[PDB]
Design a protein around this ligand. Structure first.
Ligand SMILES: Nc1ncnc2c1ncn2[C@@H]1O[C@H](COP(=O)(O)O)[C@@H](O)[C@H]1O
Ligand SMILES: N[C@@H](Cc1ccccc1)C(=O)O
Ligand SMILES: [Mg+2]
Length: 509
């Protein structure tokens, strides 16, 4: 026997590539500043800094952090307005040898206290006008106010803090556990941005994502580690689709990463500067991709916070989009294994849990040893390493691409049959008038489960037609018992569907 299938399942993981494995994020930023110090690094409204200017200010502030005890693996909470100053702060924390815990200021008190209490950050960098948000928490550590003439008085050369790439860089909270990411994964991403995405200094990277979501880390360093510029898009521009479209074209943004939940509202014929559109965070669809692939280079990027943002990508080709948009193949220095409950490899085409190995793996969850040992298991494929169990269902396709099948949690039993919520969602989305869908499970008065489909459409779709369509497209046990048209989909801050905001039907008749 030749064991072809088994060999194929390993060949798909031949992704090794050279990258600065011993360098830190700030080291990489500094080496870019040195190459082109006078390149624009960051733009916000009518203000901007060159790589040199940004570097100097980060170095100055970092020297203040050093004296106040910020060092190896020290966590520094950051709570600042979306601005150039926010990014000076992030870089300053990294330069001081510490890690930052981003806290979005648009957040409620409760969340700021969990992050602060859980992370137990010894320092909180914020701004003068935001301190009232702080009077709603039991913080005891050093509260650093960011308005510095204080900073302009310090030396602006690169510091020489003994930092390793295995030191922590940032801690981002996911649905709530704080994920510890080291420098390594970003060092790897730098090379991916250059070699895979083809990002160069000529690019202008939009900064769309919330600072508390790793997509913002993705954008920030996509710009700052390649020599490109980063454009801080403000909330009021984002809250207005026509304003956002105008911003992109006026600022001549070339690369933007957006949630499919956002892109669905944009007109591709209005967008003119975008060269590369990356969607991530949730599933995109054949209809959406078909609508954009001829205008821009469309990339579907998949990955959990736990493996440093991105584990796989798929690029739309001139060719046929099928029933699903693949999440693609593992990026450089990343391995994917689709396995059963005991970590045994599934046959090609079989559904299993997507597990990730490689250079992007997080150190684990902050102060959660047991959950860490449960999710980051010993890698049976590359002994000596760890393997992250994503909780996602997926299957290997024929062509080396991975097909995402939904969260394992979203598998509900109805009438003794197995239903995956995401599958009902994607099928209903095929309807010519439906632009967005979401399916949820609820129990009726006899505690039995039933499906409820929520959809958005420009015009009112008669339920009779939704029922007929479902009858033709879905197995009986997968036909929603109720269809509910929403004016707009309720989203979380990260741009994902907020299931707990979808109205449950009143079964009282
Ligand atoms: N491109 C994608 N397609 C489908 N689902 C995605 C995609 N990218 C991310 N996700 C989902 O988002 C999860 C990561 O969420 P989090 O780590 O909580 O921010 C992944 O495990 C997926 O379930
Ligand atoms: N890491 C993001 C997904 C993502 C992938 C690629 C780029 C940006 C974001 C998440 O947890 O959902
Ligand atoms: Mg995750």
């Amino acid at each position: 026997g030749t064991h072809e299938e088994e060999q194929y399942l390993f060949a798909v993981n031949n992704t090794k590539a050279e990258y600065p494995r011993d360098k830190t994020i700030h080291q990489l930023f500094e080496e870019q500043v040195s190459k082109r110090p006078n390149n624009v690094a960051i733009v916000c409204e009518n203000e901007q800094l060159t790589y040199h200017e940004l570097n100097v200010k980060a170095n100055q502030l970092a020297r203040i952090f050093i004296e106040k005890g910020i060092g190896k693996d020290t966590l520094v909470g950051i709570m600042m307005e979306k601005s150039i100053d926010l990014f000076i702060g992030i870089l300053a924390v990294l330069k001081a040898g510490g890690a930052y815990v981003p806290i979005d200021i648009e957040y409620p008190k409760e969340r700021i206290q969990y992050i602060l209490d859980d992370s137990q950050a010894r320092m909180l960098l914020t701004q003068k006008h935001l301190v009232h948000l702080i009077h709603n928490i039991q913080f005891n550590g050093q509260v650093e106010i960011f308005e510095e003439d204080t900073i302009k008085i310090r030396e602006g050369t690169n510091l020489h803090v003994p930092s390793k790439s295995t030191d922590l860089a940032y801690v981002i909270y996911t649905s709530p556990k704080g994920t510890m990411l080291e420098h390594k994964g970003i060092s790897n991403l730098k090379v991916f941005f250059e070699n895979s995405l083809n990002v160069t200094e000529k690019d202008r990277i939009g900064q769309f994502a919330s600072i508390s979501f790793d997509a913002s880390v993705w954008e920030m360093f996509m710009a700052l580690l390649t020599g490109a510029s980063l454009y801080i898009i403000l909330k009021d521009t984002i809250n207005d689709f026509v304003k956002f479209e105008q911003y992109i074209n006026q600022k001549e943004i070339t690369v933007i990463t957006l949630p499919p939940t956002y892109v669905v509202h944009l007109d591709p014929e209005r967008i003119l500067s975008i060269q590369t559109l990356i969607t991530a965070g949730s599933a995109t669809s054949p209809s959406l991709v078909n609508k954009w692939k001829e205008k821009v280079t469309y990339i579907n990027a998949y990955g959990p916070t736990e493996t440093t943002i991105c584990a796989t990508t798929w690029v739309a080709t001139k060719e046929t989009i099928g029933h699903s948009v693949p999440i693609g193949a593992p990026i450089q220095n990343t391995q994917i294994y689709i396995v059963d409950e005991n970590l045994q490899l599934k046959s090609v085409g079989e559904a299993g849990e997507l597990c990730i190995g490689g250079e992007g793996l997080a150190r684990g969850y902050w102060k959660r040893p047991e959950l860490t040992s449960q999710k980051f298991v010993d890698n049976p494929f590359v002994p000596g390493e760890k393997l992250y169990k994503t909780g996602d269902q997926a299957r290997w396709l024929s062509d080396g691409n991975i097909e995402y099948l939904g969260r394992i949690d979203n598998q509900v039993k109805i009438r003794g049959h197995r239903v995956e919520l995401e599958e009902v969602e994607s099928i209903l989305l095929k309807h010519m008038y439906i632009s967005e869908t979401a399916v949820s499970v609820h129990k009726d008065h006899q505690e039995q489960p039933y499906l409820c489909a929520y959809f958005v459409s420009e015009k009112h779709i008669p339920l009779e037609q939704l029922r007929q369509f479902s009858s033709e497209e879905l197995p009986t046990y997968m036909i929603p018992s109720y269809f509910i048209q929403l004016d707009k989909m309720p989203l979380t801050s990260n741009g994902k569907i907020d299931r707990k905001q979808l109205p449950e039907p009143d079964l009282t008749f």
